[PDB]
Design a protein around this nucleic acid. Structure first.
Ligand SMILES: [Mn+2]
Ligand SMILES: [Mn+2]
Ligand SMILES: [Zn+2]
Ligand SMILES: [Zn+2]
Ligand SMILES: [Zn+2]
Ligand SMILES: [Zn+2]
Lengths: 162, 162
DNA sequence: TTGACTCTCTTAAGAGAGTCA
DNA sequence: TTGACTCTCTTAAGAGAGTCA
């Protein structure tokens, strides 16, 4: 809702509810041949999810509260950032999972950044493998690696140079 | 079905036509603070594009040839790879620009790989900055860097641990 | 047979809003 | 007021197919 006090109340209610979600330990690659441990606070697989929460897609949820007799609704991971700018350089800010675990709602595993920054963490070498993200990655991205390219650059004739 | 000889003829006519596209010299980051040079063969901004070529989207084109009275059409960057497997690990192969310049049709700037591999090259540090792609990048990805994250992980209370 | 347009679709990282009880 | 569902949309890396002359 509009006032700062009301937004703080929404964040505090969200944290209290998410803080009761099951805490699931995940061991993760950090890069550099090292491994770390993350504690994700995972929304349940099926209803009921928690006070104020409802599922709008296979891995999408929303948080809703009634303030001044009006219903206010947010993407379930956006709530920690309700006091932050909602855009950057003209690009929409998104909730971005540092743990790459969509059911997790641990705000210590979330950041608020452009969709491009968000996506790119999928390929990051990780905090012990060369991550250069200013807001540092918690783990190596799940898609980091050599890839599985089927065919490389090639020509049949002699018309092209690199 | 087109024979392998007919496909090779399609590839040859495509190379002949693309080789006559304007060749544009681009200086690019390779990673490690080093700069390099790529030579892109760029399809025109507006019609006519070249024999066999037509624009189906703002940055999408198709190549079309009629063989034995049958019209055949391909995505304009897919033609170099018509004799290659079209999927890998259950994922569709995509034309993937190593120069990150969609108008370029230089086959020495293209590879053939999953959409995930394709996307991830956007954030690669580059051939002199730590690229681990098995089919090596030609340049540092355009989105490599520290990013512009607006807000990092944070909590108001003490309900969470990382 | 060819050119120059038209339309909608895929993917996987994210969103908003309506219908009922 | 709260819960549990429904639907479609955005983005930026990529696609297929129709119409008309
Ligand atoms: Mn993400
Ligand atoms: Mn690409
Ligand atoms: Zn998590
Ligand atoms: Zn990182
Ligand atoms: Zn190029
Ligand atoms: Zn690379």
């Amino acid at each position: 809702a509009l006032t700062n006090a009301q937004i703080l109340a929404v964040i505090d209610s969200w944290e209290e509810t998410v803080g009761q979600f099951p805490v699931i330990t995940h061991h993760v690659p950090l890069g550099g041949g090292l491994q770390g441990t993350l504690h994700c606070y995972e929304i349940p697989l099926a209803a009921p999810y928690g006070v104020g929460f409802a599922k709008n897609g296979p891995t999408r949820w929303q948080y809703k509260r009634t303030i001044n007799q009006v219903v206010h609704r947010w993407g379930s991971h956006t709530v920690p950032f309700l006091l932050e700018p909602d855009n950057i350089n003209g690009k929409t800010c998104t909730a971005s999972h540092l743990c790459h675990n969509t059911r997790c709602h641990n705000p210590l595993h979330l950041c608020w950044e452009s969709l491009d920054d968000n996506k790119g963490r999928n390929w990051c070498p990780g905090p012990n493998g060369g991550c250069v993200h200013a807001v540092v990655c918690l783990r190596q991205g799940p898609l980091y690696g050599p890839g599985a390219t089927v065919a490389g650059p090639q020509q049949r004739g002699s018309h092209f140079v690199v």
